[PDB]
Amino acid sequence: GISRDNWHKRRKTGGKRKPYHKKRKYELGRPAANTKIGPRRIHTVGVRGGNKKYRALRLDVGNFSWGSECCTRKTRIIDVVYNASNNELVRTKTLVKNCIVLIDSTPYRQWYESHYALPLGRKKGAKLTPEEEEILNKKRSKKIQKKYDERKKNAKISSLLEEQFQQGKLLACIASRPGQCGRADGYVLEGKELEFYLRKIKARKG
Amino acid sequence: MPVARSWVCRKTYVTPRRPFEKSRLDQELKLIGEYGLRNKREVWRVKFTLAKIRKAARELLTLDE
Amino acid sequence: MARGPKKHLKRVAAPKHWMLDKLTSVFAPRPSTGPHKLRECLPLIIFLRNKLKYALTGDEVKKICMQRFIKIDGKVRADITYPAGFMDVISIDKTGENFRLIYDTKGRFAVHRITPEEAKYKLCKVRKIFVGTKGIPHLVTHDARTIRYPDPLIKMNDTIQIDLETGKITDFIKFDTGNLCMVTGGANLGRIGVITNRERHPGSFDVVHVKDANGNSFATRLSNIFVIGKGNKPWISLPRGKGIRLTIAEERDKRLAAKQSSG
Amino acid sequence: MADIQTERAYQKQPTIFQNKKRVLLGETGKEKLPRYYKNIGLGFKTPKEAIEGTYIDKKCPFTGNVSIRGRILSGVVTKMKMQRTIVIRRDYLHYIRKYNRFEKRHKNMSVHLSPCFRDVQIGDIVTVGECRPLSKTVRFNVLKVTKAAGTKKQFQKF
RNA sequence: UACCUGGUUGAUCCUGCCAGUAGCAUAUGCUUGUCUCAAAGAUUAAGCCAUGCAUGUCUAAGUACGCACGGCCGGUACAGUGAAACUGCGAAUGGCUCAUUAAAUCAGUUAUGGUUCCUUUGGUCGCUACUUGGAUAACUGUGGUAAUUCUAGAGCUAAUACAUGCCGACGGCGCUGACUCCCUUUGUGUGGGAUGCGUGCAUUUAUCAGAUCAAAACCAACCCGGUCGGCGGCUUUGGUGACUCUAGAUAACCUCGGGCCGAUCGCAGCCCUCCGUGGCGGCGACGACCCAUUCGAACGUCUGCCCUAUCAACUUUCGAUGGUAGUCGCCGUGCCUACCAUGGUGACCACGGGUGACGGGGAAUCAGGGUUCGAUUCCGGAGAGGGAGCCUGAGAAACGGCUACCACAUCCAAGGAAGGCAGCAGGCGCGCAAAUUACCCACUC
RNA sequence: GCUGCAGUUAAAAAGCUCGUAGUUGGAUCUUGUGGAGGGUUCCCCGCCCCUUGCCUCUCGGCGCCGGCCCGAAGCGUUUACUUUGAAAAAAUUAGAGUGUUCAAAGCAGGCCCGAGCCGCCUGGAUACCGCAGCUAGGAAUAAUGGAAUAGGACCGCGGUUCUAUUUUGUUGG
RNA sequence: UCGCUACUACCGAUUGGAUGGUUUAGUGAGGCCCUCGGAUCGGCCCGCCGGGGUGCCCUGGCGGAGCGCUGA
Ligand SMILES: [Mg+2]
Ligand SMILES: [Mg+2]
Ligand SMILES: [Mg+2]
Ligand SMILES: [Mg+2]
Ligand SMILES: [Mg+2]
Ligand SMILES: [Mg+2]
Ligand SMILES: [Mg+2]
Ligand SMILES: [Mg+2]
Ligand SMILES: [Mg+2]
Ligand SMILES: [Mg+2]
Ligand SMILES: [Mg+2]
Ligand SMILES: [Mg+2]
Ligand SMILES: [Mg+2]
Ligand SMILES: [Mg+2]
Ligand SMILES: [Mg+2]
Ligand SMILES: [Mg+2]
Ligand SMILES: [Mg+2]
Ligand SMILES: [Mg+2]
Ligand SMILES: [Mg+2]
Ligand SMILES: [Mg+2]
Ligand SMILES: [Mg+2]
Ligand SMILES: [Mg+2]
Ligand SMILES: [Mg+2]
Ligand SMILES: [Mg+2]
Ligand SMILES: [Mg+2]
Ligand SMILES: [Mg+2]
Ligand SMILES: [Mg+2]
Ligand SMILES: [Mg+2]
Ligand SMILES: [Mg+2]
Ligand SMILES: [Mg+2]
Ligand SMILES: [Mg+2]
Ligand SMILES: [Mg+2]
Ligand SMILES: [Mg+2]
Ligand SMILES: [Mg+2]
Ligand SMILES: [Mg+2]
Ligand SMILES: [Mg+2]
Ligand SMILES: [Mg+2]
Ligand SMILES: [Mg+2]
Ligand SMILES: [Mg+2]
Ligand SMILES: [Mg+2]
Ligand SMILES: [Mg+2]
Ligand SMILES: [Mg+2]
Ligand SMILES: [Mg+2]
Ligand SMILES: [Mg+2]
Ligand SMILES: [Mg+2]
Ligand SMILES: [Mg+2]
Ligand SMILES: [Mg+2]
Ligand SMILES: [Mg+2]
Ligand SMILES: [Mg+2]
Ligand SMILES: [Mg+2]
Ligand SMILES: [Mg+2]
Ligand SMILES: [Mg+2]
Ligand SMILES: [Mg+2]
Ligand SMILES: [Mg+2]
Ligand SMILES: [Mg+2]
Ligand SMILES: [Mg+2]
Ligand SMILES: [Mg+2]
Ligand SMILES: [Mg+2]
Incomplete structure (x- = not known):
């Protein structure tokens, strides 16, 4: 199926390379999670060696932290505001690491x-x-x-x-990968990070 | 393919380059007659062992004492 | 072709210090996983049927081991491909004899019967010193043993003598210049001498010098040094020859002049 | 270096925190931002422009998250046209045995140059260390820049 | 043993080749008394395959109501041997072949401080309980189809299968703060304290500390050498060349159906403020979270390649080279996505093409240098008619596994079913060209 | 045809010149002796300036009559070269031992007791394994470099400027 | 040069053929993932009886209702 091998690439000189073997299993696919927001569902994938791995779908509660106070609580995730990688990840409310979210405060x-x-x-x-x-x-x-x-x-x-x-509401950054753990943890923005992200949000939409 | 056998073996003689050389012919026949040998392969055998001994000796002789 | 781990070993690819023939068959014992590496061990079947001639086939050594007669480091091993290794103790109390696997001089194990009072401890080289949960110091020796709570002045490359029945480190020798040692790898596999030097190359393979009991010097890597004594005084009993490595010329002179043919 | 925020996400060193503190611990002279840096070892000295100056390079050896181990090579700089990446050439001689004679050969390496070094230009000599794969064709990092040869950086009055 | 000989001329001296000479390995011709050793369908068709066999497995120790035998009398964990069937493990090793493959494989060298690892060995095992639930095999009985290692309905019964789930021994600290005690009301210099909350390792995020430098002078408060305004005198895990390492402290989180902390089996025994139980005593088997060890696997560093220019420029939204954020993955990484930059390779032969090219250890010949060969018993790689996609599992993109398409081909009651010898023998075809449809697990494993 | 072939007439030097890469490149930068290994000058210790050698201190073990001193830390601008160590599967190849009945092979085997020993002795060596990578001596040969519009050096100082956070017992202005 | 026999290679209408290898565009079996789906199979809750207690309760069984919640 989907593969992460290096041998379909051109070599540094720009020359093709020919394959020597069929696709292996230590070079696997497993399409993306695309975590939405909603009532919890979590599937479980069996990976190399056993070692089950939780793939989240529709998370709605996170464990966020306030670093100035050293005070961390469970909280509800309301919406996504910013996303440094893509912009279609804010139109669909998909929740990935380093996203910018509103929480309940x-x-x-x-x-x-x-x-x-x-x-x-x-x-x-x-x-x-x-x-x-x-x-x-x-x-x-x-x-x-x-x-x-x-x-x-x-x-x-x-x-x-x-x-x-x-x-x-607050402004928080996810610092965990929900597609690999099944948890949406993070930390609430402060200081220059808060100023930067607020200015970026204000500049993008509207 | 895998088997508990050994394939190590070798020849023990060498034929002469010049096949029809009257002097070599009669010298090897003198030697066959006076020691009562069966073949000339039985002369080429001894020639081979003597040549290998000589090679080893000359090889050791070029090193420094 | 090779989708998983292998379990056969060809007779031509087996280690050479096992001193096997080439006409019995295509296959070799293939020691099972254990505390010693595959190329540095000596299975039970080879030690019993080949060096001791107690058995004559594999069935005989199997039915010798299946009677709880052989003890390796105190415990009773029932497997016939168990990887016995350096500084181990074999015990066969049905006949009252104990051995000790130690390289003799020529890079192979010897048959080295010892007194029953000496077959109680064993020397072990420390490879790792780490801290576990709740700040407990652990050891790791060259034969996979783990010791909790060692005295906090033993470090890497040091030697510890441990009781075979209880673990429980008894005494220890320190890696320092002046200490007896035996080389357990490389070209000088078996020679015994004092350290006198330790060259240091940060990033790779710090080499160590050695000088034996006749003025001959030789170097090795630090990964092959094994401190076995404080100095000029071994803690375990040395085999015949004492890792001297007399050259081929002296070998021939002593074999001829003594005329060692028979009794 | 007055503003190092040029990409669409907030660039900042990990393991560094913007903490709770009082008014006027500094309104200019103490802006409450420490610098993470480590020593590479093996005798290489961390340059002061990595300790004082400010920049965000996760792939730098001295302040980023990368470990130098394995081989250590050297070369001369041939191209500086990529971002934080240069191309260096290593020439050598290959000995043919039939004839008793050598022949000239060369290899190119893409290597990573931290913004810690700002004096490099084509022609310098560069030492490198071995890191984990940093990209498709980058495995080395520049540890040290030197230029102590003829036609030097400028007229020799040092 | 560092070697030459015939042939252009009417004759001579040369260049120069043709021929002769010796070995080596494929075939073939004639001939063959003894004995030891022993290569053998590679070349061409990785062409097609009739038949038989090549992977199974039980100890005292997972489940014994088969009268299948069988005992001295019966089943009161119930005798004992034990078919079948459930369960556990192995089937990813070995064997075969060389089609593909030209910085690819492979070899020497190094790195995982960037990963996973059934098993082995060693460490770890306490924050209705004198023992829980229902339900399938074999077995009994009724059947369906031309046909298969097809399988449906009915009646029973187990677990180390499936699924639940306590008991103990906590005498466990920190945060809270009703109240409460001297003198400074109070703040603070003093001392108890119910009350409640959390309180093992493993997961996820955040935060804190990560200790010892070279000396003195005033002022506000404090220890000791001792005194009711002040002088001498302490500062405390481990390791690496180097970690954002290991260990520690704080605040939360839990993934259950989706971490751990034993409802499991076999041998042989002791004291009862005491009459079978209150009690406790060893030796094993099995299972299991975590760490280390072993056996590896994977991805990386430096150097090394046959012929070709009648191959001189190649690569790039159909990722080409780099940067930032992420998805995915066992992990590093254009591996893949979004947004940027315009890079990267080449006369030191890039890029393209050919190979009757798998690489190497090695083989033949050899004065010194070299030339040619390596399908082939050891190491590494690749494949199972050609491609492709997956299940189970520690480990497979497995073909003595499954699912499709293409090419072949078998049986049919025409509805349907079944297949993969480049495993050992054997057969057809191809060719100049290569063996028995034998016996045995006695040896090696 | 590198060792090692040919190009006037036998086959063969582009019609001629310029020219980037490639290959090649002139001369020049320290010498005797005391002891000591090989002769009767000459080739490890040190003296005409130096002859491992300058140092800067510091903690660890070493002299001696609180004091006196050398080894330990950098290393000689670098390389190629050359010598030496380390680390590189076996089999095959060279090679040591051994009367397979001899040899090709193989890794074996040899003794003494009437058996009254319930045995003894001994081997299964060694070499080679290019190139690339690691390591330490040598400094001929061949590369590369240093101050010309200077700065080397000494506690030389002058000014401005940042600051490490130790002791003044500790906590702080 | 022309002529005779025999052998080799070349150009060429045939808009030749065979086997392939890439390849625009169109379709696309099958597996995997995601969002649904809901044939069926159970449990819970209420009378009569059997067993225990204080007209009612607990295990069970029977016929059933609400089929309401609910799990696979
Ligand atoms: Mg292939
Ligand atoms: Mg696991
Ligand atoms: Mg295999
Ligand atoms: Mg085994
Ligand atoms: Mg003529
Ligand atoms: Mg004539
Ligand atoms: Mg000829
Ligand atoms: Mg006869
Ligand atoms: Mg074939
Ligand atoms: Mg068949
Ligand atoms: Mg049984
Ligand atoms: Mg097993
Ligand atoms: Mg299996
Ligand atoms: Mg065959
Ligand atoms: Mg090619
Ligand atoms: Mg390479
Ligand atoms: Mg290799
Ligand atoms: Mg390699
Ligand atoms: Mg264990
Ligand atoms: Mg039934
Ligand atoms: Mg990137
Ligand atoms: Mg990344
Ligand atoms: Mg370009
Ligand atoms: Mg090419
Ligand atoms: Mg090609
Ligand atoms: Mg081929
Ligand atoms: Mg070849
Ligand atoms: Mg030669
Ligand atoms: Mg081959
Ligand atoms: Mg072939
Ligand atoms: Mg064959
Ligand atoms: Mg390999
Ligand atoms: Mg395969
Ligand atoms: Mg076929
Ligand atoms: Mg399994
Ligand atoms: Mg397959
Ligand atoms: Mg197979
Ligand atoms: Mg099948
Ligand atoms: Mg088959
Ligand atoms: Mg066959
Ligand atoms: Mg066979
Ligand atoms: Mg025929
Ligand atoms: Mg033949
Ligand atoms: Mg035939
Ligand atoms: Mg057998
Ligand atoms: Mg000539
Ligand atoms: Mg002429
Ligand atoms: Mg001419
Ligand atoms: Mg001319
Ligand atoms: Mg010169
Ligand atoms: Mg030989
Ligand atoms: Mg021989
Ligand atoms: Mg070399
Ligand atoms: Mg050197
Ligand atoms: Mg004709
Ligand atoms: Mg087409
Ligand atoms: Mg499509
Ligand atoms: Mg599909």
């Missing part, structure tokens, strides 16, 4: 408000009266100075990141 908000005792980007406060000010402004006399005042000074999320938390 909620568990990071939960951990942040719980760890710092301080809010994210919030517009108005009425929902904070029955609940959430319960977490953020917890009724305790011990700790609530000594601990959380050492949590403060450090709780200075940058302009772009705190602007992200308002619309309820």
Whole structure:
């Protein structure tokens, strides 16, 4: 079937080479996965030596990380925004390594408000009266100075990141190959990477 | 094709280049008659062994003592 | 043609220090996978039926081994193509005799009966020192043995004497200039001497010099040195000749002058 | 080198992180970007233009992810027309045995030149090391550039 | 043994060839008493093949309700030998042939710090439980078709097949922080703490540390030599030429039906605050995640090739040379995709063509140098009429496996079924040209 | 026909010249002696300047009466060449041993006891394996290179400028 | 030069033939992958009986309903 052999190529001089043998099995095919977004399905391929290998199709949940905070959570993947290799991989919402994805951003908000005792980007406060000010402004006399005042000074999320938390989504990069592992892990963009990718996105579409 | 046999063998004589040489002929017949040999192959045999001994000796003789 | 691993060995392609004929048949024992490499081992059938003449065919050595008589390094081996190798100990207690596979002088194993008190330990050369999970130091010796928790001052190329019954490294000799050694590969396969030098070529094949007990010097690669003593004093018992490699002229003089024909 | 972002993806060294820190640790003089580099060994010295300067080359020997092992050859530069890739020529003599005489022969090699070296021009002598296949016809990397011969880089006043 | 001889002329001296001379290997002719050794359908047709055989396998130790025998009486893991069938393993080795193949194979040399590896040897094995579920063989019985190593319906019964799934011994630390105790309220200088969460190795992503340089002066706070404002005095896995290595710490993730942590079989034994069980005791077989070892396999580095110019320019969206991101792959890599750059080879013979070309170790001849041969018993490669595509498996693009097309060809009850001798014998054809349809696993394995 | 052929007339030098690659290329850059191996000057240790040799320090084992010193780290611009080591399957080839009854072959075999030894001795060597790659001596021969609009060298200094992060006990301005 | 016999090679209408090797364009068996598909086969949940307990529950069996969920 499909083959990865070197012997169908021209040699460096531009000359043809003639084959000496039929196609082997250590030179195999196995067409692409083309992971979409949706309810999970994962098939399993038997490869050289045994060693099953998981090929994902329609993943919808990932394990992403925030490196400044060292805080990693399970999250939902919403959409793909950028793709350095092709552009038809954003029209079809296929999810490959080094893609740029939107995630749900909620568990990071939960951990942040719980760890710092301080809010994210919030517009108005009425929902904070029955609940959430319960977490953020917890009724305790011990700790609530000594601990959380050492949590403060450090709780200075940058302009772009705190602007992200308002619309309820983030920008993340996949750092794992879902076609080989069946997992869509990665890390949320920050700093100059975030600026570069935001400018690229703004420049491409529209 | 694979077999437990050996194929090592060799000839033990060499014919003379000049086939009809009266001197060689009568000298080899003198030698056959006085030692009561059957053939001339039995003279060429001894000639071959003497020639190989001479070759080995001359070969060793050119090295430095 | 060759889609997988092979399992036959031709008699003409077998190692030469097995000292086989060429008229018995097309095939050779083909030692099974073990702790010693294929070209550097000595199967059980060859050691028993060829060097010891205890057996006369392959059936006889099979039915000698199938009676739990032969012990290699303490344990009872039932296979007749087991790859016994350097510094191993054979034990046949039905007759009360123990051997030790060591190259004699001419690049082949000898028959080297030893005392039963000496057939308890064996010397092993260290090839690898790595750390496992939870920071436990491991060893790897020249016969695939793995030791956990060695004292953290033994390194590569050092020799360790181990108890055959328990593992449990007992003592060790260090690779240094001045230590007795036997060469276990190459052209000087069997000769014994002191180190006196170690040339170093970063990137490939650091060579080592040796000088035996008669003023003769010879070099080898570091991959073939085997420290067997502190210096001028072996830890295992040496065979007859003691790796001296007397030349062909001295060989002839000693074989003629002694007139070694019979008793 | 003011802007090394020329391709459609963010070029950055792996194993380097843009961390959480305070205001004005530097607004110019400390831009919070360290440099990964390693020493090749075998006596080759890492050039300072790889430690100081900034560029993204995963295939460089000194800062990228590649290991030099095996053979070490040398040659003269013949062509510099590819991106980070040069063509060097090695000449030698082949001894024919029938006649007792030699004959001149040559081989060409495509080799990888890191942006660490910026002084190379046709005619220099170049040392190379052996790496894993880096492309269809590239297996070597330039370790060292030298030019200490006649008609030197310029008039000899050094 | 570094060698020559006849032939142009009326005769002579040369150039120069024809012929003679010796070996070697294919055929053929005539002739053949003894004995040891032993090549043998390569050349041409990798042309076609009637018949028989060439791959199977059980120990005390996976499943024994065949009365198939058979015991001293019966089955109370149940006697014992044990057909058949399920299960496990092997069938990828060996044998044969040389069609293809010209930097390809192959040889010497090195590299996997860029990969996989059944088995062997050594390390690793604890974060209803006195034992779970249903359901198929053989066997019994009814059948279908011209026909095959075709197979359907019906009735039973097992597992080391298929599928579930606890028990123990955790007395396990870190993060939480109701509350709580002295004096500085508080912050902080002090000491307990329920409560909850996570807590083995293996996978995936991210992050942290990866320790010892050459000396002193003030100021805010602290250890010790001791004191209620300050002087002398410590800084701690392993390895490589070199790793983004090995090991460590943190936050999560789990792939289940799709990691591990034993519902398995055989030999022979001991104490009971005690009357068969509460208990424990050795020796094996098998199985199994991971690491190392062994046997390899694959992909790479440097150098090495017969004739040809009546082959001088070749290669390139039908990837040609390089760059960035990815897909796929056991892994490195235009291997393949997207976007860029315009490169790469050549008179030191590239590119194209031919080979009655598989490469080498080697063989014949040989003063010194050379010339010719190597289908062929050892190593490597390739193929099973020609191409192509796959299943199982550690390992195959397998043909003594399967699925199609082409070329041949067999049986038919014309609906259908079945095939691959370049394995050993044998046969037809081709030719100048090559053996018995024998016996045996006694030797080597 | 490289060793090793021919081209006036036997077969044969392009009609003539220029010219890139290819092949080839002039001369020139340190010498005696003390001891010591081979003679009676001449060919490993060192003296007219040097004669492995300059160094820069540092940690490891070495002198001696806290102090005194040489071997250890770079290496001699590089190569080709030449000598030597390492690493290269067996079989075949050369070659050592051995009365197959001789030889071609093969890897065997030889002794002493009436058997009363429940045995003993001994071999299965060695050479060659080009070219390419690895390694260390030699420095003739042949290549290649150095400062002419200089800079070599000494703790020579002057200025500006970056900084390693050790000790001042530790943590920090 | 012309002429006789015999042998060899050449040019050539025949728009020759045989065997092939590439090859534009069109069709395209079969396997593999993906998205569907759903012949059939079970389990769960409710009465009567048999076995156990407190008119009901648990294993099982029977006929069945809802055939609702559901797995292959
Ligand atoms: Mg082929
Ligand atoms: Mg596996
Ligand atoms: Mg085979
Ligand atoms: Mg075997
Ligand atoms: Mg004449
Ligand atoms: Mg005449
Ligand atoms: Mg002739
Ligand atoms: Mg007779
Ligand atoms: Mg044939
Ligand atoms: Mg048949
Ligand atoms: Mg049985
Ligand atoms: Mg097995
Ligand atoms: Mg199998
Ligand atoms: Mg045959
Ligand atoms: Mg060709
Ligand atoms: Mg090559
Ligand atoms: Mg090779
Ligand atoms: Mg090779
Ligand atoms: Mg094991
Ligand atoms: Mg049934
Ligand atoms: Mg690329
Ligand atoms: Mg890549
Ligand atoms: Mg061009
Ligand atoms: Mg060509
Ligand atoms: Mg061709
Ligand atoms: Mg051919
Ligand atoms: Mg040939
Ligand atoms: Mg000769
Ligand atoms: Mg051949
Ligand atoms: Mg042929
Ligand atoms: Mg044949
Ligand atoms: Mg090979
Ligand atoms: Mg094949
Ligand atoms: Mg055929
Ligand atoms: Mg298997
Ligand atoms: Mg096939
Ligand atoms: Mg086969
Ligand atoms: Mg079949
Ligand atoms: Mg067949
Ligand atoms: Mg046949
Ligand atoms: Mg046969
Ligand atoms: Mg005939
Ligand atoms: Mg014949
Ligand atoms: Mg015939
Ligand atoms: Mg047999
Ligand atoms: Mg002549
Ligand atoms: Mg004339
Ligand atoms: Mg003339
Ligand atoms: Mg002239
Ligand atoms: Mg000159
Ligand atoms: Mg011989
Ligand atoms: Mg002989
Ligand atoms: Mg050489
Ligand atoms: Mg040299
Ligand atoms: Mg005619
Ligand atoms: Mg066509
Ligand atoms: Mg198509
Ligand atoms: Mg299809």
